[PDB]
Design a protein around this nucleic acid. Structure first.
Ligand SMILES: [Mg+2]
Ligand SMILES: [Mg+2]
Ligand SMILES: [Mg+2]
Ligand SMILES: [Mg+2]
Ligand SMILES: [Mg+2]
Ligand SMILES: [Mg+2]
Ligand SMILES: [Mg+2]
Ligand SMILES: [Mg+2]
Ligand SMILES: [Mg+2]
Ligand SMILES: [Mg+2]
Ligand SMILES: [Mg+2]
Ligand SMILES: [Mg+2]
Ligand SMILES: [Mg+2]
Ligand SMILES: [Mg+2]
Lengths: 50, 203, 104, 116, 119, 155
RNA sequence: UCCCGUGAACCAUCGAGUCUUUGAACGCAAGUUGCGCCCGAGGCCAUCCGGCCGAGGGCACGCCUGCCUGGGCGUCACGC
RNA sequence: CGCCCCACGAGGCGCCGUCAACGAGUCGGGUUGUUUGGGAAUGCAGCCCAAAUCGGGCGGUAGACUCCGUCCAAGGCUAAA
RNA sequence: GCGCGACCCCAGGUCAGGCGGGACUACCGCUGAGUUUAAGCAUAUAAAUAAGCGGAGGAGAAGAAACUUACAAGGAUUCCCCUAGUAACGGCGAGCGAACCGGGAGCAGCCCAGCUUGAGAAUCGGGCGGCUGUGCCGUCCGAAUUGUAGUCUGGAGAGGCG
């Protein structure tokens, strides 16, 4: 909500920085397995629940 | 040699001298807090024989405990079971009140280690035990050859675990032959030893 | 350390000798081997046993005497040989005897 | 006595006088000027602030307060702030709008540090 | 800059160099947002040199401070030998060797002698 | 604390003290007590300040002469165990028991002991005042075994 | 220049260091970066040689040994 | 392997006969609950009773007596297996 | 209008310290079921367990007989083997169940309180200072005579003698 605690804003910051598709270059690091970012979250699908 | 005189004086516990001096103390005790520091043993010869010394770091605490048994703490007295564990009010606790006093003082006095405890007064409601504790940090106790044994780490919360003189009595270790053989090393260690299905290699 | 010849208890085994825990004070005294010093020179001491028979007492004395005949003891210091010790030439030939050096 | 109530007497206390200091080393300043002023944000929306309103937009350590921001903006850059506004931008860091007293020129400072 | 030369410096010059490194990182952090290329990488060197000079400062300061409070005086909780809580509470050796008179006599007399057999 | 220590003495008043404890509350009268304590002060035990000098200055008598010239120093004796030892060997020529020892059982029996072994005793008032004689915080019992020949009659 | 060496390394290893907010968690709290008190390196002016901004650091609870300040005719002595 | 040499104090061994102190609401008893293989009750616990010093606990059937064997509680520490 | 000593007890951000929490294999203590078995079930069994609440160490607990035995007797603790699915116990039903003896593994005994310096607290602590720094020494304060230290622990021991 518009009146959010600083703790919840603090944790929304990090759950924001944790949404980006994996960098283009990681994919060529040696003996690599990370393929796509399997920890995406969408605001309409998976609610943080906090 | 005074301790023998005072020893028999305290042995004659129905004489009128002890009846007086003991009832008045029962009033004084009943008017003070449950756990209280007392600067001197009230029974110096009893304390001597249990290892009290007039040396710094040995402190004496009077713990008041209540009398009577243990009534099963369930939601009303309603025990879900078969008629044979369906009783409430006549069950007795398995640790003596002396040990309960030691183990009350063990929870109150975190930093100091229980050594012993001895009866001092009693009535219909309460028993009063004076519990000798030791400060295992003061140099006068760290440099005594006779009582270092209590500063080694295997001796933390003796009373919480059953290792004092009153502890052994309710653990069943006053006794040696049969009549006391199941209680060594402990009744649960005996039970495990006796239940192990020993399946040897070349059975 | 050494052990006594004793009899077993219990009718089933009364006739079979076996090793005990220690020589009684009476054997250690009558052998010339003091109470405090028998564990020092490798002889057990058992304060709890009772001797009721000359036969047992003399048998255990015989074990003590044989052991004191074939015992060698190094000095507490290098040159100071006191009473109860043994000669240098005796000490130079002592080995670690292994197994049961007195079978019962 | 006068009153039927015994209130506890007045005793006297001494101040702590340790025989050994608990923390010997002198604590360094960790919210120093260089932590407290990370880097000036240089979006075009802020570039407009530089020339319209005589303001510099910094990104400051999240545990900053306006008093420390003005003090550091003075020690660094050798200016003063007539007023600072702060907000914690949703990505996580704090952003501070430092308005210069109109003695100093924001263009001049922006070109003394290189923003525009 | 190399720790060999840093340990070979005065206190004031050491503080100067910290001021200079944090100002050089000040400038590289500025130009991270705008410019790029070859001065974007000097950041990592400058950060590590800040760490070097601060580690030098702290190591030398605490070494001096041990030299002064290690006069066998009361030592502070940031110098007192941390090992583990159990080790700190064990008894000292002169305290674990503490015995009684009836026992120190039992060893001054009547020790454990050295014996063999077959004599 | 004050409240309980007041009903303490009040309840000791109300209750019927048995004779063994009531032989106290019958103390020495002030005049004879002061006369006695004058002699007790004359025979005080040794100061800490004075006990270093007596061991310091015999150092030379041992080092050079090698011969001890001490005569017996005679002072009052104290301490419950020691005084019961003296009394029960009957080496105690005068006993002075504090009335107010707590716990009382430490001296409930010294009157009877001195009585049935025929040793003169008094139940004086003030264990702290006894303690002052010997330089301790309490004394709880004193006894005299021997006095100087210059004051036998006074004794 | 990191190269026949005070010397690279997402190297091994461990002694010298740092170790934000928390947490038994300890100033009081807590859907609060909420609200207190004490000390204080430094500097300003002087409403005095004092006050203000301070960097840092403190303030829990029960306890043990010692010390300081106290209370109670509880027991006393010595006194007005 | 070297320098320092161990005593009038302690211990051992032997003689003696006079001493010879040993742990209290603790043991023990009744009853109650639990526990046990422990059975006129194995332990433990509550409550009440409540000690002894030519004395106390045991000898797996409750009891009185005579004798016997056995040990000395109610304080504490202790590796290895 | 006093100066005091003790006792009890206060408040101290006083000097120096010790306590809480965490992991679960094993170890110690309390608490404590029922499904099941009994071809029903109500004691019994499940079980002196699972769960619950606490305490430690690297092992813990136990431990030098107020023991067993009836022998020609043995001699602390612990574990393995046998004793023994036996004595016992049990709606004597289902079921349950140890010990002494013996064989092995390993082996180790100790220390206090008391009557016992009284020509003399010889004991201990804290502050300060010095050094050889896990301590030792010099000095001050204090604890302690309601007894610290020393001798003694039943196998003895205290004495006197050699
Ligand atoms: Mg929706
Ligand atoms: Mg705002
Ligand atoms: Mg139960
Ligand atoms: Mg029963
Ligand atoms: Mg019953
Ligand atoms: Mg033990
Ligand atoms: Mg139930
Ligand atoms: Mg069924
Ligand atoms: Mg069925
Ligand atoms: Mg059914
Ligand atoms: Mg069963
Ligand atoms: Mg469980
Ligand atoms: Mg153990
Ligand atoms: Mg068979």
């Amino acid at each position: 909500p518009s009146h959010k605690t600083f703790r919840i804003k603090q944790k929304l910051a990090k759950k924001q920085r944790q949404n980006r598709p994996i960098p283009y270059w990681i994919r060529m690091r040696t003996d690599n397995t990370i393929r796509y970012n399997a920890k995406r979250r969408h605001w309409r699908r998976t609610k943080l629940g906090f | 040699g005074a301790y023998k005189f005072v020893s028999e004086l305290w042995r004659r516990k129905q004489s009128d001298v002890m009846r007086f001096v003991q009832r008045v103390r029962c009033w004084e005790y009943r008017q003070q807090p449950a756990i209280v520091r007392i600067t001197r043993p009230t029974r110096p010869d009893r304390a001597r024989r249990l290892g009290f010394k007039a040396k710094q770091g040995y402190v004496v605490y009077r713990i008041r405990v209540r009398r009577g048994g243990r009534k099963r703490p369930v939601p009303k007295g309603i025990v879900y079971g078969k008629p044979k564990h369906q009783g409430i009010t006549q069950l007795k606790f398995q640790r003596n009140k002396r040990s309960v006093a030691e183990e009350r003082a063990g929870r109150r006095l975190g930093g100091l280690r229980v050594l012993n405890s001895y009866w001092v007064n009693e009535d219909s409601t309460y028993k009063y035990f004076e519990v000798i504790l030791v400060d295992v940090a003061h140099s006068a106790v760290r440099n005594d050859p006779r009582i270092n044994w209590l500063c080694k780490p295997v001796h933390k919360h003796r009373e919480l675990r059953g290792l004092t003189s009153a502890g052994k009595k309710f653990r069943g270790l006053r006794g040696k032959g049969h009549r006391h053989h199941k209680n060594r090393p402990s009744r649960r260690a005996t039970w495990k030893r006796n239940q192990t299905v020993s399946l040897r290699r070349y059975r | 350390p050494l052990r006594p010849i004793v009899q077993c208890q219990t009718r089933k085994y009364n006739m079979k000798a076996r090793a005990g825990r220690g020589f009684t004070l009476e054997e250690l005294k009558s052998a010339g081997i003091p109470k405090k010093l028998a564990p020092t020179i490798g002889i057990s001491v058992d304060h709890r046993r009772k001797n009721r028979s000359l036969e047992g007492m003399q048998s255990n004395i015989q074990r003590l005497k044989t052991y004191k005949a074939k015992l060698v003891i190094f000095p507490r210091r290098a040159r100071k040989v006191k009473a109860g010790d043994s000669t240098p030439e005796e000490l130079a030939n002592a080995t670690q005897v292994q197994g049961d050096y007195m079978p019962i | 006595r006068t009153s039927v109530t015994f209130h506890r007497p007045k005793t006297l206390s001494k101040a702590r006088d340790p025989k050994y200091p608990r923390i010997s080393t002198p604590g360094r300043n960790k919210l120093d000027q260089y932590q407290i002023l990370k880097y000036p944000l240089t979006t075009e929306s802020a570039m407009k602030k530089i020339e319209d309103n005589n303001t510099l937009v910094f990104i400051v350590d999240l545990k900053a307060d306006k008093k420390k921001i003005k003090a550091a903006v003075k020690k660094m850059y050798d200016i003063q702030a007539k007023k600072v506004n702060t907000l914690i931008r949703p990505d996580g860091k704090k952003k501070a709008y430092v308005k210069l007293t109109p003695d100093y020129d924001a263009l001049d400072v922006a070109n003394k540090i290189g923003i525009i | 800059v190399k720790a060999g030369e840093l340990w070979n410096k005065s206190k004031d010059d050491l503080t100067k160099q910290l001021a200079e490194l944090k100002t050089e990182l000040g400038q590289l952090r500025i130009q991270k947002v705008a410019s790029s290329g070859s001065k974007l990488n000097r950041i990592h060197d400058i950060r590590k040199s800040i760490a070097r000079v601060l580690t030098v400062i702290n190591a030398k300061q605490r070494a001096q401070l041990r030299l002064f409070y290690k006069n066998k005086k009361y030592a502070p909780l940031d110098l007192r030998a941390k090992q583990t809580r159990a080790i700190r509470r064990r008894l000292s050796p002169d305290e674990k060797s503490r015995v009684l008179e009836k026992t120190k006599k039992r060893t001054v007399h009547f020790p454990q002698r050295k014996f063999a057999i077959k004599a | 604390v004050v409240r309980i220590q007041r009903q303490r003495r009040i309840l000791k008043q109300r209750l019927k003290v048995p004779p063994a404890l009531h032989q106290f509350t019958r103390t020495l009268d002030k005049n004879l007590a002061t006369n006695l304590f004058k002699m007790l002060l004359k025979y005080r035990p040794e100061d800490k300040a004075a006990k270093k000098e007596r061991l310091l200055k015999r150092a030379q008598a041992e080092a050079e002469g090698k011969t001890v010239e001490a005569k017996k120093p005679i002072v009052v004796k104290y301490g419950l165990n020691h005084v019961t030892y003296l009394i029960e060997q009957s080496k105690a020529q005068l006993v002075v028991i504090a009335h107010d020892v707590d716990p009382i059982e430490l001296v409930v029996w010294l009157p009877a002991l001195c009585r049935k072994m025929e040793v003169p005793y008094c139940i004086v008032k003030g264990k702290s005042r006894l303690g002052s004689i010997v330089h301790k915080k309490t004394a709880s019992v004193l006894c005299l075994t021997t006095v100087k020949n210059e004051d036998k009659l006074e004794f």
